[PDB]
Design a protein around this ligand. Structure first.
Ligand SMILES: NC(=O)c1ccc[n+]([C@@H]2O[C@H](COP(=O)(O)O)[C@@H](O)[C@H]2O)c1
Ligand SMILES: NC(=O)c1ccc[n+]([C@@H]2O[C@H](COP(=O)(O)O)[C@@H](O)[C@H]2O)c1
Ligand SMILES: [Mg+2]
Ligand SMILES: [Mg+2]
Ligand SMILES: [Mg+2]
Ligand SMILES: [Mg+2]
Lengths: 464, 464
């Protein structure tokens, strides 16, 4: 990895475009005006990509050669990069201040700021915009996961009186559905800020290496069938498959995909009659989890629950809602996103089924079907020093007031009523609003403040 | 990287679920029934992740210890992985057959197949489903990019009578807007199958390392301003910024973002009047490229063109369409995806503006706002041998005939009319349709067939 090759190409040409005599460029990141965002993921980027000696004579030469062919022109700032190497031993003269990881902040507030600490490196603040803006992804995954957690909590609470097992109600199925192995790790780690169930193994080592937990691992799974392990038995032998599987995993929870041929037959006749004896004998800590995986997500869930409630003994919990026996549960892992998640729990509630009965798995909806536009993430320059004089800068496009950016040096504060405000134009210095919530997390190639994954989870907790 | 930790958790448990005495699992990938897909990107995965000694004693121990905590149980197949290490020196006993990279194949056809080459490793076929399914991403980027090239080619040909410069009409702006560095390189490389203009530098090294080109680099950029390089001058010095930048890059093309405050004033008064003398003196190989970046993408493009047409000498080309002078172009880089690209070129044509006048930049629309469900990409087991007996397997969910999978051993063939057909149930062996178009690309830890990026580009060419 070479940071000289990890920017948008045009930024290679920007040192020539700033006003002469500019000694400082100061920039900030926000989720421009999903009302609140979980701040998460900068720490990964700082450590993996930005810290320590990131410039070598070899990396300078490699970039020079690449850019000469890429632009068909010599535009690369070899002098500026050589300055960083000889003067700072390849360490970035940059200071980054950020809200603590896991913090839950309203839209349209400063989340982190970036500035150069040596006047020669004015061009470098925005060099690393590209790398840092990629923080949109763990923010957005963490925020969207936590929004699905609110929906789950609300409905579990209304239908059961408590939130037991909430952290296992939405399982990460997204490893195959994301764009790369690196994306898998990051996105899976962001989901684990809110939940504990994952099949995206990649998230585990990222957390262990960049954040840390007191528990041996941040995420857990259970044995579960796929269509290959059912269909391999042959079309007439679905029952044999089911029997073999629940018997292999008789004393842990086991999820068994039941829609290979006919989900409704599988529930009513195979589980419901032929194999019933192997189900009712199961432990409360070791249920069968029936998994549909096709059909209209809501209709399928409701029809599966209706079948199961006629074949197995159903109770009525203290809230008035129906509850399958403890050795029997359902997971809906097809077509699940924040919208369909809401539709299903509401549809369940209308039909008087407790949310205790159901869990969700989500792949693409959880980790891939998300863009930087969803929270309007944006990195902009708000302050420059030119000829020793600070000026407050910003954009304000005539046809889109929504792309207006903030002016000057910025700070984040608690308001008197306990909310948040971003102060502009250096007005945080007047100190009428308490301490800046932004902390220096990076300075001159060193990570200066770190959060464990346990503090992040605490910070991102629901109101509850 | 540890391949033993690069699968969906549940697959760690599958070796215990297949029928006893299973010696072969055979699986295939298709884009289930955008009617044609560009097959691209498997070779990256084969080289980066799958080839060579991928199993060590230390990787087996890492995974053993993680899985023990992750499942709270010993499910992990330590013996199976040890078998591979001892018997094959950690080389995977797997054969992958694939259509050539760059090939354009209709939906619902076999693209690659995976099978184990040692009966002991029957479980390994679907172990690596998760890693291989990630091929959806480069396939989908290359396909969607090529679909945009088709729209661009149509309207450029219609408005100008040729396709000159088509390969530079859609530029990759997506580095910051993807979910990771690895994704940026993969996606940017997929776009470069069709086009040559890119700001996502990560794409280049990926192509060089994994595919190779005749040319020193597979993609190119030009100098370009961003908002910080205009706004740093101060609201009242937008003209000074513009003058400095076009004069710094007076002999190469230069893109200048012009909507910091008022795109229409910038075009009509700053470029059109105050600085017009610095523009009309520019060379054909060094245009000024005006970049709007806000507003309704079509309305903004049409009004910018109308403004410039009144300030600059417009000609009418041989097809009857209006053409700005050759020192002056426009690039629309905000809000661009396949739908808005179509709307702008059609709206342009409607108002009699040649598509010569315009180029596009696209970030999230190009590399991020894409999922595995756009081409319905799916990896499934179709054939198994159990007790020396081969059986044709498949799923066929009752409530979704779209999820029906193919049966048995598969081959891809040319029809008598030169179309494509996927033969099922081993019927390729009858030889009524010529020879299988898949080639073994991986066998027993070695890449056995490879394509250069130049061959890929030729394969992926448009008809026209
Ligand atoms: N443990 C599991 O049951 C498990 C894990 C990973 C993926 N899956 C599969 O992934 C699919 C969901 O993918 P998307 O949400 O990306 O469409 C489900 O259809 C499911 O079959 C299942
Ligand atoms: N050379 C360039 O002008 C250039 C390069 C990379 C990104 N960008 C910016 O990225 C934005 C596009 O982002 P999305 O397409 O992902 O929304 C544009 O608004 C543009 O300002 C521009
Ligand atoms: Mg599935
Ligand atoms: Mg699917
Ligand atoms: Mg922009
Ligand atoms: Mg934008």
């Amino acid at each position: 990895f070479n940071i000289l090759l990890a920017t948008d190409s045009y930024k290679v040409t920007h040192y020539k475009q700033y006003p002469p005599n500019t000694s400082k460029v100061y920039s900030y990141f926000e989720c421009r005006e999903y009302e609140e965002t979980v701040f998460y993921g900068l720490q990964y980027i700082l450590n993996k990509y930005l810290k320590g000696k990131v410039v070598t004579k070899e990396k300078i030469q490699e970039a020079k050669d690449v850019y000469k062919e890429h632009f068909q022109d010599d535009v690369f700032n070899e002098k500026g990069w050589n300055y960083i190497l000889e003067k700072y031993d390849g360490h970035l003269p940059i200071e980054i201040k950020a809200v603590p990881e896991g913090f839950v902040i309203p839209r349209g507030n400063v989340l982190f700021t970036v500035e150069n600490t040596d006047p020669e490196c004015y061009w470098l603040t925005n060099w690393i915009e590209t790398i840092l803006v990629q923080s949109w992804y763990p923010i957005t995954v963490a925020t969207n996961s936590r929004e699905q957690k609110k929906i789950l909590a609300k409905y579990l609470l209304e239908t059961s009186g408590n939130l037991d097992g909430l952290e296992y109600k939405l399982h990460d199925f997204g490893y195959r559905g994301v764009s790369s192995q690196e994306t898998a790790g990051i996105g899976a780690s962001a989901h684990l800020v809110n939940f504990k169930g994952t099949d995206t193994v990649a998230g585990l080592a990222l957390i262990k290496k960049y954040y840390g937990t007191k528990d041996p691992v941040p995420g857990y799974s259970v044995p579960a069938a796929e269509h290959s392990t059912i269909t391999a038995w042959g079309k007439d032998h679905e029952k044999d498959a089911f029997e073999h599987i629940v018997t292999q995993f008789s004393s842990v929870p086991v999820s068994v995909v039941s829609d290979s041929y006919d989900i409704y037959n599988a529930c009513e006749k195979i589980w419901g009659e032929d194999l019933r004896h192997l189900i009712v004998s199961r432990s409360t800590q070791a249920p069968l989890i029936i998994r549909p995986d096709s059909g209209n997500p809501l209709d399928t869930v409701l029809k599966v629950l209706e079948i199961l409630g006629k074949k197995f003994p159903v109770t009525e919990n203290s809230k008035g809602y129906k509850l399958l026996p403890p050795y029997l549960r359902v997971i809906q892992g097809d077509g699940v996103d924040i919208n369909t998640l809401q539709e299903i729990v509401e549809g369940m509630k209308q039909k008087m089924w407790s949310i205790e009965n159901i869990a969700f798995g989500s792949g693409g909806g959880l980790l891939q079907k998300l863009t930087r536009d969803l929270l309007n993430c944006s990195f902009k320059c708000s302050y420059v020093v030119t000829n020793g004089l600070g000026i407050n800068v910003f954009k304000d496009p005539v046809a889109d007031p929504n792309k207006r950016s903030k002016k000057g040096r910025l700070s984040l504060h608690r308001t008197p009523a306990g909310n948040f405000v971003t102060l502009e134009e250096g007005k945080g210095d007047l100190e009428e609003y308490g301490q800046d919530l932004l902390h220096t997390v990076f300075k001159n190639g060193k990570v200066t403040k770190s959060y464990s994954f346990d503090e992040i989870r605490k910070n991102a907790q629901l109101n509850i």
